[PDB]
């Protein structure tokens, strides 16, 4: 009988892998672009004193295109408690829908499956995937993930593709910072209770809805805690050219006169967008 | 959102592995073949191209089978011996992969493909088809 | 001056009159059929439309055949009593005229046509091919 | 270098620092070239305990 203004909610988003992907904006819902397959060979080291030449072999230029997929939903009320409420469901629901759009879009753009969802780069499975060796312990051949791998992985990016960031669930980064050498000293941040370098300078954008190999942060691995070989760990790609995210129209909300039967006021919302994988040579995946 | 693209570039059969079917190309003004394999080949497979004429009796049935001549474009050095058009599906062409060729100069009103002699053994595993481009009625 | 219209809208056989075929439609974004009869029909024939899914044993071979649901737009009133999309070539289609059509919503990776029961002895006189549109990858 | 029994060949970091600073001094400046992977095969080297 002393109703407060407190609205403890206690729910989380992810980070967003959206400012990484190259952005493009389209008005029509069907765009088309060109691609250079290969320049091909032109001209050989011919001999001298040969009044002739060779036609070589011409290149190839493909012409691709891709759609934009839409995302819509509906939510209604009763119009009776909406008049006596000590709150505003509508402004809450409007926010409670955009939150569903932002998290569904980013997730789909990663793991979307073909039809009527942009094909994410995970399921596309054309990024070359690098899998790590297992280790020995008391004769057993448990799979593992040593700091030696992470440096080998990040550095093995072809230098001419450009500068490329890395993405991984923060529990992997927690796994890295806490490795110990033979004696017991830490590997990173020797003797300061915590290792936390400026990620931006080490080119590691961090997220929380990637496959997260350390299952709920409970599979470091010595016995039955092995990483369950075949799990995603981290990815690395020159994102501004490896993957594009298209945008057509931001979300809208429109009352639906008709269907509202004088009890149930029924709102409608939707938005249109899409994405597609560009040249999937810039980009690699690390795996257990 | 997919478009009913059968009108505006329809497609017809031309060799189902056992019989050629003439396809009328008069009402349209561009066309091409899209080969496709159904099982691994044994060696190179060669196909002849034929064009027909409106039959002498009935003007909407194809006439006989005349072999279409072939033309070069500067860079021809193969120059098929008898100057008659032909297409050679190269060996080691896997399934789930299609090759697409087209004769440059159109003549007649029905075109057809047929397995060249000496190559009709492993030609039952190919299936050519045609797709026209742009009605001109 | 006709173009190699094969690439950029290729086509494949989907029903040669004796057995069906699955055609992959992942690499493309829009597609449609082009029916064509070879001999006069005797009654209205009906075909069922099926979509496949990537098999678990190998993601480059289609799995079992599921039947695509039916989507009404606004004008639809027949609804085909089953909620399972199907085509029906009407009677009196002379075998020198094609008919085009396509489903409004694809799903899966593959698509297939087969004659519905009752009209299996007339479908031996028809041909159904699929031509796609722009390639996504 | 010897492994358990056999004689698998290898290439250690010590084998690189010994090669570079073994160039006849009176030849002028001398640089060196290598495939990117080889450089990424000296970065990820471990001593006895765990240290890079």
């Amino acid at each position: 009988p002393q109703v407060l203004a407190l609205e403890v909610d206690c729910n989380i988003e992810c980070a967003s892998l959206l400012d990484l992907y190259g952005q493009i904006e389209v008005s029509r819902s069907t765009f088309t672009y060109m691609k250079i397959a290969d320049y091909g060979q032109l001209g050989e080291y011919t001999c001298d004193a040969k009044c002739d030449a060779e036609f070589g072999e011409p290149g190839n230029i493909r012409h691709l295109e891709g759609k934009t997929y839409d995302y819509r939903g509906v939510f209604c009320f009763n119009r009776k408690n909406l008049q006596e409420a000590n709150y505003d469901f509508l402004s809450f629901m409007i926010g409670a829908a955009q939150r569903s759009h932002r998290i569904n879009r980013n997730q789909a753009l990663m793991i979307g499956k073909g039809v009527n969802e942009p094909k994410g780069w995970l399921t596309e499975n054309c990024f070359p995937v690098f899998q790590t060796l297992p280790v020995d312990v008391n004769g057993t051949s448990t799979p593992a993930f040593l700091a030696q791998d992470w440096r080998r992985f990040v550095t093995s990016f072809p230098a001419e593709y450009g500068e490329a960031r890395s993405v991984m669930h923060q529990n992997v980064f927690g796994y890295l910072a806490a490795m110990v050498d033979a004696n017991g000293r830490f590997l990173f941040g020797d003797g300061d209770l915590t290792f936390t370098p400026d990620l931006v300078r080490e080119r590691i954008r961090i997220s929380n809805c990637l496959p997260d190999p350390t299952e709920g942060n409970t599979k470091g691995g010595t016995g039955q805690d092995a990483f369950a070989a075949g799990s995603f760990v981290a990815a690395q790609a020159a994102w501004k050219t490896a993957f594009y995210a298209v945008e057509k129209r931001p979300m809208f909300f429109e009352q639906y006169e008709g269907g509202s039967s004088a009890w149930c006021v029924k709102y409608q919302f939707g938005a249109e967008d899409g994405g597609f994988v560009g040249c999937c040579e810039h980009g690699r995946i690390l795996q257990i | 959102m997919n478009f009913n693209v059968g009108v505006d570039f329809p497609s017809f059969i031309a060799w189902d592995g056992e019989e050629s079917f003439p396809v009328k190309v008069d009402g349209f003004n561009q066309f091409g073949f899209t080969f496709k394999t159904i099982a691994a080949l044994t060696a190179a497979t060669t196909f002849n191209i034929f064009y027909h004429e409106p039959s002498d009796a009935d003007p909407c049935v194809p006439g006989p089978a005349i072999r279409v001549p072939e033309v070069p474009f500067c860079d021809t050095v193969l120059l098929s011996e008898d100057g008659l058009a032909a297409v050679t599906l190269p060996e080691t062409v896997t399934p789930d992969s299609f090759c697409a060729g087209t004769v440059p100069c159109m003549n007649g009103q029905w075109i057809s493909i047929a397995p060249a002699t000496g190559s009709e053994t492993n030609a039952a595993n190919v299936q050519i088809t045609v797709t026209m481009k742009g009605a001109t009625r | 001056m006709n173009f190699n219209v094969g690439v950029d809208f290729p086509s494949f056989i989907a029903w040669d009159g004796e057995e069906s075929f699955p055609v992959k439609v992942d690499g493309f974004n829009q597609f449609g059929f082009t029916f064509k009869t070879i001999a006069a029909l005797t009654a209205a024939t009906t075909f069922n439309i099926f979509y496949h899914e990537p098999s678990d044993a190998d993601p480059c071979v289609p799995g079992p055949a599921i039947r695509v649901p039916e989507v009404p737009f606004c004008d639809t009133v027949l609804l085909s009593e089953d909620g399972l999309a199907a085509v029906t070539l009407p009677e009196t289609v002379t075998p020198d005229s094609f008919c085009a059509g396509t489903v409004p919503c694809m799903n899966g990776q593959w698509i297939s046509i087969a004659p519905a029961t009752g009209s299996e002895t007339n479908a031996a006189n028809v041909q159904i091919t699929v031509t796609m549109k722009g390639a996504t990858r | 270098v010897d492994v358990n029994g056999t004689s698998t060949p290898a290439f250690l970091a010590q084998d690189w620092r010994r090669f570079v600073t073994s160039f006849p001094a009176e030849y002028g400046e001398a640089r060196s070239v290598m495939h990117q992977n080889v450089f990424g095969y000296l970065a990820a080297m471990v001593d006895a305990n765990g240290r890079f």
Partner: peptide
């Protein structure tokens, strides 16, 4: 004179191990 230009339909994955320099071992 016809010229063909085919291209695959389904891609294949690309797995490869990531062996790293071995445990330092003395040559004696």
């Amino acid at each position: 004179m016809v010229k063909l230009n085919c291209r695959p339909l389904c891609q294949a994955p690309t797995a490869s191990r990531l062996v790293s320099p071995p445990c330092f071992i003395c040559r004696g």
